[PDB]
Design a protein around this ligand. Structure first.
Ligand SMILES: O=C(O)c1cccc2cc(O)ccc12
Ligand SMILES: O=C(O)c1cccc2cc(O)ccc12
Ligand SMILES: O=C(O)c1cccc2cc(O)ccc12
Ligand SMILES: O=C(O)c1cccc2cc(O)ccc12
Ligand SMILES: O=C(O)c1cccc2cc(O)ccc12
Ligand SMILES: O=C(O)c1cccc2cc(O)ccc12
Lengths: 243, 243, 243, 243, 243, 243
């Protein structure tokens, strides 16, 4: 009761004896339960606020799965506390809204780099510092994805703090013209804070919004997005077990 | 199944028929369950990611209780979708870390104004726009609090995107000298975005960190913080049922 | 001659033995003469540049009346020197140009908060710090105004350094859409610098420009504006004598 | 009564039939009365708030003398309205605080350029735009000053919105090291806004503060500053009558 | 004479018939002459200001070699005009000053990402946009370098506009603590502008300054730097001929 | 060989025994060869990258001529190293693109002031610091130019880091309306860094682009630009030999 408040990190509620060097983070707590279905020797570590934390084993490698909620500030809390617990490699398995016409629902966006349009990373360092993915991780992600059939795109995503501003339309058109593939709320914060803490970082995003329907299409789309999530999780697991 | 995706807001997962004009928001999903214990005719509306949404009745007035997770971006999603559902008055019942020496754990900080050091509100409008609480709400909060015994402080809080930067020490000392009472991650975003959407807004914060112990003190402190949370919730409920 | 340069503040030209804790500031030197007509035991304290300084008594309370000229920099000089002389409560009785259609000439705008679009407050502190009015003062201002017949509006004003830029039209439309009630040159500087110096602060503004005429209307409008000024001064005096 | 509000500029309260193309501006209203003592055919044009406006004749040339109060915002109002009245050449006769050790009281600083650390000019144009004095005017100012005995310095001044910030000490040392000669509140705004409105502009500043005393020295210093003011006014008058 | 001004790009002085899709850029004109010594079928294309442009063949692939002078603005001119001439892959072979202790002269820094502390890229796009190297190119650079003996480092470099500011010491220590490997003047501009123009981009830097000597050591150091340059050029050539 | 690396500045490759107090800088290395044709006792000092450095004598005065390449960063390197070598007066003889309709090719723009829209000067000091030309130098430049027939214009130029951005059209129209005479890449950096290093600075620009043709006109235009360059060089030489 008291020894836990002493030993555990205050938000993710785990310690260095529990956290693997290899970690997958995702925004949605329920996604953690889905991801561990792909793994053996699964155990619940902690549940606190938006932070749901499990360990599992994939091809002999222990990997920690951690939800972080929506947005840079909740991601950054997780990244810092995971680092304190001995994390060394962190892959985000997330969702994105497409910023280019021909990206279908359930297709994947692999963030090589990210526009730092969220405030969280800016608390740490000038915006001029690059948010980009680790080469070692991208190499394995590429090797895995090129050997299957679902379409995927490597490039730049935009991370931001709100899609509900009255300028959303203007922003979407501007960023589309700059060749941004998709938008999320967290990738740039993982890339910036993680790199500064010496972590290897990457981000694999399931497309869940078209750039721009009946019950049948609705069901088909849901299945496509579920398939994309599964592919993203598998790609991350395959990448991390090879480290 | 399909009609819900049509009718419900995509994150808080409720509609205009469900949401009261009067709303309490909090960061912690489990706090919603604690708050509704103070209310009658309670019903679960939605549970999605960090958004846990209930209705209850307090002295004849229906009030919606909504968790929002940690950080401005998740708060802003909630504020926007609540507005779309017909919210008119929103009070944050939250936690803060004290920025002045003599603020004890479980004492309350009522945010008259907030430093906009989070990125979320900046997506909407120049930082020069004031984050401040609605007079109508502050009047009722003051009237209630002055008639009880727990210490409370009206003034400025700082809202930010990270307490884990290497400059945290420098920031704390700077802001202490400027007379800031406490820090959180969300108040300024509620105040800025809410006011811009025409909402009456306020924020009542339970102090959960001293500016600067045995098992006994640990238990005493936990009780004090629980008492402070309860007081904050009651103050918000008393304020909203009088609108 | 020499002892005065030693004892008096260098711009307002008064000392701590002269200044009341309770102060009204206004931009126009001649307005001071008009305000003291409402007061007893009136005495001229100092006249220097745009700073015209008088004491008077209103319902048994001594209150200092001080002009400050146009603009944040001249206001800030006054605020700092008044603070040094022992001021504790300062109310601005000023003029504004309306930023909403239905605000008539001589109606009052009570600034709950202010957009810090002037440079003066920015010299002191990041623009993210809120410019807002003190609750204690707003409560008394509201109580007084609700008991009379002239229309008044509580909300946000914009303070700025120039209404003569070629973008004035664009600014007016932008700020109108954001729900700003009116514009002046000084309120945000009083609110920011005053709060930082530990002063209770408020601002009551007479509307002197429509958002958007014969000799008869011209005379009627002048009378309306004079009536509004008188009401603003009375409201400030009633508020301060009750402290 | 009504025709005046139609014809006169709203702050300086004069029209195009009254204002000379050649104008001296100063902060202090009482300085206008002192300056016109050096001139013939003097007439009071207007008195409104901090704006005291006179015409006089110096060596056959009619020149308008206009006070502007303290600070960029009140200066800018004057510059804009003078421009509207047909001003073409404007010289500031002002005061400065020295930022270098060996500048004595009553010695003159001629601003070749100015640091735009005031908000007023920033309302008009990016800070990257240069605040500098007109060559035609500097040539005549130099020609006049080199032919007399009081020490004077050509170079950069800093214009700002407050000398009362808690960082004043840090600012003074920083700017001293950058070779700034002196500080005022208005020069950069005249230079920036005036140049943008197509005016020839210059600024001659009487030093009134040492960078860093008995009744005797106090009197001697006052005389020195009065002599410096007189020299500055004469230099401006000699320059403008030669245009 | 006249047809050339019509057909050739105005600074690099070549056209689309001359430029290969595959290009090496370097700052030093004389480095171009050294690089082409490694190539067959070499021809001088143009010589204009700091832009010295040659074609050569390396393992059957035609590659253009182009000097760009020092600094982002001259680099950006080259990138834009090369793009207009049909460039698709551009590798910078440059020099850097080390920002970490154990990087020896003539060891290589491969820029995965770059801090955009130069103004050139900022003319195009918000600093929040990432300056990073293309995965396809990094994969080949890594594959080549891991198969030889000279030490090399993948990571972040800082690109800037001056190493001669009085804050150079403070900057070096700050950036060293952030884990930056080395500094140059151009990499971030190539990465930002090149990516925006749809180019594949990379940067291989020869270390020419220790983070922190007799005639013998001087000669040894010069040889080491020459060997490093040669290695960098070979790596770029090997990478591009495989595209 | 080794003593040179010890004694010479690392980019301009000259020392204090070689550099005159009086210096002309230009962007184009080949322009140095053209300028020295106007001079006696000419000697090549150094050739390194874009830096071509010669001494010559003009009417008994030794003057150093130094090319600097394109852009602020390469200019700033030259300014700093020239200062270290004992330079005291530096005049830029450069090219500009006209920003006003009636400025013909080969007419001269004398920069009184410059918009600091390049990053190089910003590395040194806040953009609010003025980039302007030295009075002593402008006086002599004016005296010389008024006594000949080629049209010339004194006023503001804009210095920037790229003319190839997609906003070039918008920028040109904006700056044209603000009365900017012409644009280059270096003037503001010379003015800012040079003034901070205590140098007397000026800039004389040959117009080489109309704001907005057959072989005959092409040849006529080339001659006009050559004549303008010659005039600019002569003006600089006449100015410096009189110091
Ligand atoms: O359990 C599955 O095989 C599965 C099937 C469908 C969707 C899934 C999504 C995940 O994130 C993980 C696993 C799945
Ligand atoms: O259920 C309670 O009475 C209670 C008791 C203790 C702590 C509480 C905190 C809340 O937010 C709400 C209610 C309580
Ligand atoms: O003297 C008055 O009663 C009066 C009458 C009319 C306008 C006034 C304006 C003031 O600011 C103060 C007083 C008045
Ligand atoms: O009236 C004077 O001769 C005089 C004498 C002394 C100081 C002065 C200052 C001024 O600005 C103008 C004139 C004077
Ligand atoms: O010519 C060489 O083999 C050589 C030898 C030494 C250094 C070199 C540097 C280069 O950039 C290219 C080639 C070399
Ligand atoms: O050599 C010349 O007389 C000459 C003739 C034509 C153009 C010139 C340009 C220069 O920069 C310098 C000299 C000239």
């Amino acid at each position: 009761l008291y020894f836990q408040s002493m030993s555990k990190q205050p938000h993710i509620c785990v310690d260095e004896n529990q956290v693997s060097p290899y970690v997958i983070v995702c925004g949605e707590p329920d996604r953690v339960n889905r991801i561990v279905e792909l793994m053996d020797n699964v155990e619940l570590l902690a549940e606190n606020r938006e932070y749901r934390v499990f360990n599992g084993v994939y091809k002999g490698t222990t990997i920690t799965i951690c939800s972080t909620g929506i947005g840079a500030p909740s991601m950054i809390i997780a990244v810092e506390e995971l680092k304190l617990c001995g994390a060394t490699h962190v892959i985000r398995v997330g969702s994105a809204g497409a910023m280019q016409d021909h990206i279908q629902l359930g297709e994947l966006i692999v963030a090589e780099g990210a526009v730092r349009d969220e405030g969280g990373s800016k608390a740490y360092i000038s915006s001029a510092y690059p948010a980009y993915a680790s080469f070692a991780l991208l190499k394995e992600i590429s090797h895995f994805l090129e050997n299957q059939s679902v379409k995927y795109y490597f490039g730049v995503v935009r991370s931001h703090d709100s899609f509900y501003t009255d300028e959303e339309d203007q922003l979407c058109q501007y960023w589309n013209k700059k060749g941004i593939l998709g938008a999320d709320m967290e990738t740039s914060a993982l890339f910036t804070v993680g790199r500064l803490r010496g972590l290897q970082v990457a981000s694999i995003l399931n497309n869940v919004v078209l750039y721009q329907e009946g019950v049948n299409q609705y069901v088909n789309d849901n299945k496509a997005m579920m398939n994309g999530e599964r592919l993203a999780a598998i790609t991350a697991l395959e990448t991390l077990c090879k480290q």
